Amino acid sequence: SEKHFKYVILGGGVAAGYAAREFAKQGVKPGELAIISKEAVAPYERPALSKGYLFPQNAARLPGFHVCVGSGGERQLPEWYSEKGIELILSTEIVKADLSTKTLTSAAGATFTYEILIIATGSSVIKLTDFGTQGADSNNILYLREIDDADKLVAAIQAKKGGKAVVVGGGYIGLELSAALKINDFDVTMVFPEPWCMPRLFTADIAAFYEAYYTNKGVKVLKGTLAVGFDANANGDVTAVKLKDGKVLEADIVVVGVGGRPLTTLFKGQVAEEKGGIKTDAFFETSVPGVYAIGDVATFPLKMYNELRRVEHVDHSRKSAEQAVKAIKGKESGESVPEYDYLPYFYSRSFDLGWQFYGDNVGETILFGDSDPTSSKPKFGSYWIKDGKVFGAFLEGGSPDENNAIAKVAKTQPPVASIEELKKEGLQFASKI
Numbered sequence: 001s002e003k004h005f006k007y008v009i010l011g012g013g014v015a016a017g018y019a020a021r022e023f024a025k026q027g028v029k030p031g032e033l034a035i036i037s038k039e040a041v042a043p044y045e046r047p048a049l050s051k052g053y054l055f056p057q058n059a060a061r062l063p064g065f066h067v068c069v070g071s072g073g074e075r076q077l078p079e080w081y082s083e084k085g086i087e088l089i090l091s092t093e094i095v096k097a098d099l100s101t102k103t104l105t106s107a108a109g110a111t112f113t114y115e116i117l118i119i120a121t122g123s124s125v126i127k128l129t130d131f132g133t134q135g136a137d138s139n140n141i142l143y144l145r146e147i148d149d150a151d152k153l154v155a156a157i158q159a160k161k162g163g164k165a166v167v168v169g170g171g172y173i174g175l176e177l178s179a180a181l182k183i184n185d186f187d188v189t190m191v192f193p194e195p196w197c198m199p200r201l202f203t204a205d206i207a208a209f210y211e212a213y214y215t216n217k218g219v220k221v222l223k224g225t226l227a228v229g230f231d232a233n234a235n236g237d238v239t240a241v242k243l244k245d246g247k248v249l250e251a252d253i254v255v256v257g258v259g260g261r262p263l264t265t266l267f268k269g270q271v272a273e274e275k276g277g278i279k280t281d282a283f284f285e286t287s288v289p290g291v292y293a294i295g296d297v298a299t300f301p302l303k304m305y306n307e308l309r310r311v312e313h314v315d316h317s318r319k320s321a322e323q324a325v326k327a328i329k330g331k332e333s334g335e336s337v338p339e340y341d342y343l344p345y346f347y348s349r350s351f352d353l354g355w356q357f358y359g360d361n362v363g364e365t366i367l368f369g370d371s372d373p374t375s376s377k378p379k380f381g382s383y384w385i386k387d388g389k390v391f392g393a394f395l396e397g398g399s400p401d402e403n404n405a406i407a408k409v410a411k412t413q414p415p416v417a418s419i420e421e422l423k424k425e426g427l428q429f430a431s432k433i
């Protein structure tokens with residue numbers, strides 16, 4: 001009954017799917033590796049859940065977006081794993097991890113042993129019920145982290161067709177959700193307390209473009225307020241959203257985007273933690289030899305900024321997954337592996353927009369380009385200047401070359417003698433580098 005594998009990746013997300021591609025490249029043998037996931041499907045490109053998955057027509061659907069298509073790689077269907085002798089253990093939640101005995105136990109009591117462990121458990125979605133919010137347990141108050149959550153949302157959009165939606169949260173998930181609900185023909189109201197949307201990255205100037213663009217699209221942006229409770233009917237279904245300011249919004253469906261946290265509960269005490277995640281070295285190895293932490297759960301050395309960091313980027317999930325397998329196989333062969341040198345890269349898409357950010361959002365900012373929301377193809381960016389150098393670069397509506405140019409600016413940190421002249425140059429500055 002108990003199963004044994006040389007390597008076990010715990011989790012079936014983006015990092016797990018990309019670690020498995022790296023294993024096949026490294027020559028993994030039949031029977032050696034297993035991926036244990038609580039989801040009923042093979043690893044897939046998570047960012048698709050708040051994008052094409054929510055389309056009313058010609059939506060993204062599995063098996064279409066299984067990894068590694070999101071980065072231009074080959075689709076890894078369930079057949080890809082079985083045909084390689086990679087054991088895909090689905091619908092299995094590991095409720096107990098004993099690192100000292102190298103044994104994991106599933107919710108059904110089944111046990112599994114490994115020689116090497118890769119922790120790719122990602123993040124769990126924050127819910128309003130965690131806060132103890134009045135009426136937050138009403139039906140049709142939905143979240144979006146996994147494909148079952150996406151399927152519940154796609155069912156609710158269909159059941160509540162042409163109704164009222166309230167989106168709680170002003171991050172990029174709130175933005176992508178509001179845009180999705182609007183392209184599905186809902187009356188949409190977006191609620192968040194910050195003085196502008198995407199507060200952890202957008203400047204007031206960048207936010208103003210997206211707020212105006214969403215307003216033109218019919219989305220009602222309600223900044224400076226917070227959802228404090230909900231009304232429900234006799235079936236327990238949400239009927240309204242109560243706000244801190246006394247306003248009461250009618251709602252047929254509520255979709256919440258209030259963040260996430262690393263899913264490291266199984267390891268508390270057994271591994272060193274820092275900055276919310278499991279601490280790793282430049283090779284994603286934890287304080288326990290042979291136990292690795294990749295993707296969302298990892299607090300790793302961010303080499304170019306000389307500090308430990310934790311990120312929630314799909315690029316980091318893929319790259320960190322490759323780094324760990326290279327470190328594991330390199331130790332088997334005595335081969336040296338260079339340190340993880342990640343350039344922070346984040347992106348978001350909604351409506352006909354699509355932006356990319358590289359580097360670090362620190363220092364003084366300048367906006368450049370065409371930032372008119374009514375333009376047929378808005379193309380505008382922003383630079384962050386710290387210690388007289390470009391530290392961060394943002395671009396909306398860039399071409400693949402223009403996006404590569406701002407990544408090279410954020411990677412090389414070119415000198416800025418004049419911030420006024422840098423704004424004059426604009427996007428031409430990134431191309432002339």
Ligand SMILES: Cc1cc2nc3c(=O)[nH]c(=O)nc-3n(C[C@H](O)[C@H](O)[C@H](O)COP(=O)(O)OP(=O)(O)OC[C@H]3O[C@@H](n4cnc5c(N)ncnc54)[C@H](O)[C@@H]3O)c2cc1C
Pocket residue numbers: 010011012013014015016036037038039046047048049050092093094095120121122123144145146263266294295296297311312313314315317345346347348349
């Ligand atoms: C809707 C959505 C949209 C996003 N859009 C973007 C975007 O546009 N750009 C971007 O850069 N990033 C985006 N992200 C973030 C990005 O997808 C994540 O950073 C990435 O998925 C993390 O990879 P991961 O493997 O660490 O985590 P996950 O993909 O979440 O993988 C974790 C896996 O482990 C499983 N698991 C957890 N605990 C257990 C357990 N105890 N037992 C068994 N299995 C377990 C989970 O079910 C899941 O399969 C988005 C995320 C979401 C939720």
Ligand SMILES: NC(=O)c1ccc[n+]([C@@H]2O[C@H](COP(=O)([O-])OP(=O)(O)OC[C@H]3O[C@@H](n4cnc5c(N)ncnc54)[C@H](O)[C@@H]3O)[C@@H](O)[C@H]2O)c1
Pocket residue numbers: 123124125144145168169170171172173174191192193194200225226227228257258259260261312
């Ligand atoms: N990229 C990031 O900086 C970041 C930060 C946190 C989480 N995430 C992760 O990425 C995904 C996207 O998260 P995000 O960027 O949308 O989250 P976020 O942390 O950036 O923002 C959550 C939003 O919800 C708002 N909010 C909280 N309580 C509220 C209430 N009661 N009423 C109204 N608004 C309320 C917050 O003020 C904020 O605007 C998630 O899956 C999460 O795991 C990303």
